[PDB]
Amino acid sequence: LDSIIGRLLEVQGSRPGKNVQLTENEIRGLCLKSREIFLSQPILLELEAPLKICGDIHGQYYDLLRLFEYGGFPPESNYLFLGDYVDRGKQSLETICLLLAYKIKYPENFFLLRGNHECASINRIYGFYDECKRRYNIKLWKTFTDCFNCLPIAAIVDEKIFCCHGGLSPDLQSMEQIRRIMRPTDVPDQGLLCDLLWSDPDKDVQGWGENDRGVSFTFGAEVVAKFLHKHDLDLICRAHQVVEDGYEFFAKRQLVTLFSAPNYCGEFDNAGAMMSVDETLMCSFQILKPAD
């Protein structure tokens, strides 16, 4: 129904913090429907330009509306999201709902990837399960899990821009490896899938190194360079990490990092960004600053 998406957009213009309390049936519907569409589409998305790409939102619902305000609400534009929708922020429930709605309404112009914070392992503890349990019930959180497990892992835009939440993997040799993993699936402790959602680029590291997070790896400019060449690609688009200005380059503009949730947590005191990728595969960046 358009009723749920209407009610979600209704709090636009309101002072930041006002909730939107859907019925659990609506939300359940949103999960089950979008779940079916996720398994309808490939786990490795073959996408086309033009599209706008966003990074971590982490429940900051009113900042998401600002991004849509500028970028045009679907289907004014096409959208890829690089995961990490829930936790840390005040309104995870609204955020994931609005997105799934759009995914259901425009399944061919709106796309969602799995971020590391789309696991029962990490929704618990970091704030999402708490929100479900406070505003709804445990059973509803289990539903969300079962929906998150069907999320796409990576995407490729016009056979040139590789998009995923975390980054590269030492176990990644061919793309057909990404197409092999059957959904639904939980993110494992270690391996290809986990690396894709957890790994980081590192300036000081040479090759494959340890990660301060405690899971997966750090990688260096050499791996980025040789990966693009080996796969007929020009750029790696990823999120996962907090960077001021919203975006930050790695290697010689061979990997960009996108973070779309301003003043994350906070404090951190950062900014958010999104990539405008046009039909000529030209990328431009638009910055969001922390609101008054």
């Binding site: 020009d234 030209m282 910055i287």
Partner: peptide, 13 residues
Amino acid sequence: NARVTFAEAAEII
């Protein structure tokens, strides 16, 4: 046919 390019200037929203 098409290759990746970056607009040098960014803009504030």
